Amino acid sequence: PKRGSKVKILRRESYWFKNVGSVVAVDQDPKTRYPVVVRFAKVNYANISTNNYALDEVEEVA
Amino acid sequence: ISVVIFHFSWKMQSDVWGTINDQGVVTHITAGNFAQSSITINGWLRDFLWAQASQVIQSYGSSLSAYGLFFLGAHFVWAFSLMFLFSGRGYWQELIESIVWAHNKLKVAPATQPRALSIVQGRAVGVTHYLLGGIATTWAFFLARIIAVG
Amino acid sequence: ALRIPRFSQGIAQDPTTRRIWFGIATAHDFESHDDITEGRLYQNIFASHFGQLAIIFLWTSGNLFHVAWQGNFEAWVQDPFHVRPIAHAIWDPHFGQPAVEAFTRGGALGPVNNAYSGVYQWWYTIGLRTNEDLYTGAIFLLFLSAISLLAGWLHLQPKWKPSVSWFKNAESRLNHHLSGLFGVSSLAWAGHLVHVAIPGSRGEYVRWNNFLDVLPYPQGLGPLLTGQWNLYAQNPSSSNHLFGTTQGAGTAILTILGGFHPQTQSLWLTDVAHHHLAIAFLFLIGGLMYRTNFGIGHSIKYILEAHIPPGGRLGRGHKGLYDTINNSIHFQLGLALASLGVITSLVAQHMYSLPAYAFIAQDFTTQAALYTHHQYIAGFIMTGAFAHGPIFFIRDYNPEQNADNVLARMLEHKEAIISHLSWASLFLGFHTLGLYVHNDVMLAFGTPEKQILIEPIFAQWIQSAHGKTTYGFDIPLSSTNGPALNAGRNIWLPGWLNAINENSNSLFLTIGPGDFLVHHAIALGLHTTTLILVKGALDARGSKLMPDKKDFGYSFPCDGPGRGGTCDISAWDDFYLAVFWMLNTIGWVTFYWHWKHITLWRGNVSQFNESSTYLMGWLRDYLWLNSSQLINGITPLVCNSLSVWAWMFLFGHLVWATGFMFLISWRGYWQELIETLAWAHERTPLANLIRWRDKPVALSIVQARLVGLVHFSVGYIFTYAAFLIASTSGKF
Amino acid sequence: PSLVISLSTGLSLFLGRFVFFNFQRENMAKQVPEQNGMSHFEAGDTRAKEYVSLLKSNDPVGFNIVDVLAWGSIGHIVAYYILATASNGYDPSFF
Amino acid sequence: SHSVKIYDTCIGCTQCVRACPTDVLEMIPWGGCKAKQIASAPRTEDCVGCKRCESACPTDFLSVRVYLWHETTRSMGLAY
Amino acid sequence: DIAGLTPCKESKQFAKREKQALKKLQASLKLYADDSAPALAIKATMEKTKKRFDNYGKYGLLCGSDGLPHLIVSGDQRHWGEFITPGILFLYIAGWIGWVGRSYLIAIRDEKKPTQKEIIIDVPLASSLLFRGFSWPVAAYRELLNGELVDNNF
Amino acid sequence: MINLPSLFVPLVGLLFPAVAMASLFLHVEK
Ligand code: CLA
Ligand SMILES: CC1=C(/C=C/C(C)=C/C=C/C(C)=C\C=C\C=C(C)\C=C\C=C(C)\C=C\C2=C(C)CCCC2(C)C)C(C)(C)CCC1
Ligand SMILES: CC1=C(C/C=C(\C)CCC[C@H](C)CCC[C@@H](C)CCCC(C)C)C(=O)c2ccccc2C1=O
Ligand code: SF4
Ligand code: SF4
Ligand code: SF4
């Protein structure tokens, strides 16, 4: 239902993080740990940004 | 360079500049000191500083009133080099969060994510700054020596 | 490939100069050193931390032994005050015949050092002026030297072994261990500062020997028992009584109201003989607070998990910290420099503000000597005191043995202490320092008339109520008839007023204007020689840059180009930076004092007051003037007796300086180069048959920041060091 | 002009509290023990205390503190010393 | 003798870890990411905190560093 | 009159070291005093000064030994203002820059897409974005303590 | 007989460390 919404990030892994919104896309391909494709408009020490995610996380509001 | 100048200004003077009087006798800004009181390393603080600087040390309420006003904020800004030049770099970035919380949580904060000055960039200041610092200083200084005992 | 040295394979097989750095350097690092059971290090420290107890004890059995040889006490007894307080005897086979013109000083006959260790009074006080009754403190701090290395030799033996448990036990190592440690220690002390010192201050070869057939108090040992005492405070040693002498020698013992009498100029004897004989009971309650066996007295524990109040109908819930401060040694080197932190600084004036012996308040050479020192450890203990304060974090703390209680919480809300200790400074950044600068503009531009020197209004309140009656301001107490100074108008409060203000008293010093211009500045320093610390410590738990320095540790040498956004990054190398700004923050509060104080000892107290409120004042005539006695006891004629720092100083002024290459001149410029000729001398014949045991490399970047620090500071501990002394033996 | 009390009452006040307690009931709590060897805190355990160890000996405790101080202490130094010599030398109540 | 510990996800490359100097690079096949790839070091004995190994290598939290302690004439670099 | 520090009017130092300090710039007879620039080292200036002499006076600051302004407010007598009567404004003069500072920014997510949308300032200022700066606290300073903070926003 | 204690200083500086930089020359080849 939430495809790329204002959804949170929540694991002792990240950079940005609490920082809210955005799950952009989500796959259906099972193996890994990395289903949750995030892109915001705020950045770590790369520039392309967007690195991937999932599992013990999205502990969020609307 | 910020040596060599030096050697010069204690030759021209002390042992070249003069004045006149008369009985065969030229009389220099300072003594034929030098010869044997600029051998020893020291001789240049005994007699190249606190023997000079007097010029600038006192030198307020006057017109030496800039060279009593430069190497001040020229010593700091010889100084405010090492802070960027002895310092770390990750240490500083690591920092500019912390504060960040203040703006952000209280929503102000940039988006030109205020990162902390790039390594080279701060081997691009304690270079300029050091290297602005101990110059003026010595031009805040060497100056005001010359003119009244000049 | 290279088996030696030891502790671990790692660096002991390693084949470059490192080993020797990375032997010697990391050589008391054992608590992460592959060779250590749960004892081994706990085991270690013990002998270890006797061990030095040894030399501290051979620190002085000598230098005691040293004097009476050397110097001239048994002499100096005839007349007690000039002087050139006398250190050691200097066998320096380079010194030009002018060894006469050198240091044929005090009692000499040889180019002796000018002693400044104070002590020479701390010994005059306890008792002796007879060095034939020295020879012994020597032999005693030997009676402790050999003796205690059996605590060495021996209790470093599984048999009369230690445990580990025995070490973690809290309520014994502590509770019991106030009572002994301090407690009793005084008594006899508290009493020696009573029963062997009095009788010379009365004047009497009391010695040991005649050790009962004295009875310095007439009424034996009665009223002590009984319930009646004031036949003791009875007639204080009195008013003129040339000190430790004849006349006015008003027998009494345990006194506690008078204080100084101009002559000693120094807290009068056996009126701190009641002091040491009171503190006691203030642990000898809170000193049988807990335990040994017996089922009565304290646990601690619900001290917390109940007593987390002050806190909790919300808040923090302690459910025990403990298994942390008792499991995590650090804490035992978290707070045993941490708090023997403070003491250093609250000894850094008590010790002066009112002395304690054979004349120092008017020596102006201890103060000079025996101060800054006792300050620089309030540095070098107070600092590197939070270091073992990151540690437990990345190297004792488990976020889960604790994440109920304050610390982990402290943490959860940590990026805050950081940023209010910060706003604590950017401000103590512009101000105390913005103002401060037309206080340096005007004063230059003929305009001192107009000027921003805002005179302290606050400290101000104190120092009067606490007695001091010096001009203006019609309030109570020090009224010299006032109702905090009443109800108690005799107890404690004539004497500590009788000397309160004319300066050969220095007591509560004469507050000037801009007095806070440093005072403020010194409540800048700190707030900005923390945060370093309380990062280099705090978030240096992990960060988010590299959210795992947790693994990494405390002492990782920088980082490399890693995504242009990383570098010098040890929580260690935040202690590095921390030890910069602190020596800055001492940088300052030793100017003040020297400026100030110096002022007085030659009457001229426009050596501040007039000046400092605009810094060339500092530079001109704190810094520029006074000198070239020192730096003209060198001066193309000779050397006389202030010769040294004229050397040492330029030393500090070199040995500083070159803590610079290492520093500005980083790492991969050294190898590269030290190759291009580590190489040249590998080709050139005759000195060809020379292949060298290991193989010359440049220096771990840490190091290349360390020996930046111990050439530096060493330089920097130097000079001011030699100056603060130089200075005063010319001018006072 | 000072009654050295308050204090010197309380320097005794709880001295007298652990000569105290416990003649018979075996050997004076628990049991005994703890001593050397080590049985207690961070060998393992390290928990979890109550405290009703007060309530017993209190009603008792008051008597002895706040009068023997007037029969011992501020109660002569007593005759007696007898025995005798007389007696220690027999004493003035010191005074 | 290479350290400390360094972590998952990337590879392929074509835009990440393609540039250790002293090798220290396979690529197993392994199943998880969007085609198959898990890695640090089929090695680590030729390297050398050549730490250019994440500069080229994203994926979130510390990602490359050094810790050589022993520190070795294999990768302390100094040949001659 | 408090702590010292006398109100200036007994003149002892200040007033004199003054009529000394300034007044050997005045011995600038050492030039030629009529009309100048090139010189007026003498005649004028002292107008701001000496013809403001007994003028400065005049409210005391209880200028003190040395004979100079030991400038103090702390909340006693008339002074409760030698820096506070000019002590509040600063507070005032700053953090409503904070309002512009805020609402300038708190616009830099509105009209949408931001940053250098910070470098090109959209001449950000002149009225309510500033000209609210005028009126913030005790009428609306608790723009703080409700819906804007919390924070509460999105 | 008499004159000295120099005995010590040509040690403590001259041979002693001459023997420090001698036997831990080392530590290595201790
Ligand atoms: C984060 C802090 C930590 C803390 C808690 C302290 C605390 C202290 N340091 Mg310190 N220090 C630290 C880190 C710390 N330090 C670090 C990292 C360094 C390395 C640079 C130092 C270096 C250092 C030096 C060199 C010295 C100190 C000194 C002191 C003491 C000075 C007394 C004072 O505060 O005057 C003012 C304090 C007041 C409380 C008066 C102002 C009252 C205000 C706050 C009123 C508002 C509240 C309320 C009405 C008052 C209740 C509080 C009450 C106590 C009055 C104080 C105990 C000095 C010292 O040791 O004593 C001789 C000094 O020697 N420190
Ligand atoms: C806070 C504030 C402020 C402050 C400021 C200050 C206080 C400053 C100072 C600072 C310091 C403390 C120092 C500095 C100084 C400066 C300088 C130093 C400059 C320079 C320069 C130049 C440009 C030059 C050049 C040259 C040449 C040509 C060569 C030879 C030499 C010389 C130098 C001449 C301001 C106003 C901004 C604003 C508002 C607020
Ligand atoms: C302080 C410091 C920084 C942080 C310094 C920064 C980010 C420079 C600040 C840039 C300017 C001053 C921005 C501040 C605001 C100004 C643009 C103007 C506002 C102030 C008034 C004039 C109005 C580093 O990045 C660094 C890197 C490597 C070694 C040492 C250091 C180092 O010491
Ligand atoms: S210390 Fe050297 S290796 Fe580390 S980031 Fe800085 S420049 Fe690179
Ligand atoms: S290190 Fe580089 S190649 Fe390896 S998984 Fe990470 S990003 Fe991919
Ligand atoms: S340290 Fe880094 S660059 Fe060097 S081989 Fe290893 S992963 Fe590659």
The counted number of beta strands of chain G is: 0
- Oligomer kind: part of a larger assembly
Contiguous helical run count of chain D: 2
Instruction: Compute the separation of the termini of chain D in Å.
Output: 18 Å
Q: What ions, cofactors and ligands are bound?
A: chlorophyll A, beta-carotene, phylloquinone, iron/sulfur cluster
Q: Categorize the overall geometry of chain G.
A: rod-shaped
Compute the CA-based radius of gyration of chain G: 13 Å
Q: How many β-strand runs of chain D?
A: 0
* Radius of gyration of chain D over all CA atoms, rounded: 20 Å
Question: β content of chain G, as a range?
Answer: under 5%
Put simply, the count of helices of chain G is: 2
Percentage of residues assigned to helices of chain D: 10-25%
Q: Helix content range of the residues of chain G, please?
A: 40-55%
CATH superfamily grouping of chain D: Chlorophyll a-b binding protein like
Order of helix and strand elements from N to C terminus of chain D = HH
Classification by helices and strands of chain G:
mainly alpha
Largest interface summary: B-C, 40 and 47 residues
Order of helices and strands of chain G: HH
> Structurally, how many domains make up the residues of chain D?
1
GO biological process, one term (chain F): photosynthesis
Keywords (chain F): Chloroplast, Photosynthesis, Photosystem I, Plastid, Thylakoid, Transit peptide
Protein name (chain F): Photosystem I reaction center subunit III, chloroplastic
GO molecular function, one term (chain F): phosphoprotein binding
Output the keywords.
part of a larger assembly; 7 chains; A: SH3 type barrels; 0% helix; G: mainly alpha; binds chlorophyll A; binds beta-carotene; binds phylloquinone; binds iron/sulfur cluster; photosynthesis; Membranal Super Complex; Photosystem I reaction center subunit IV A, chloroplast; Photosystem I P700 chlorophyll a apoprotein A1; Photosystem I P700 chlorophyll a apoprotein A2
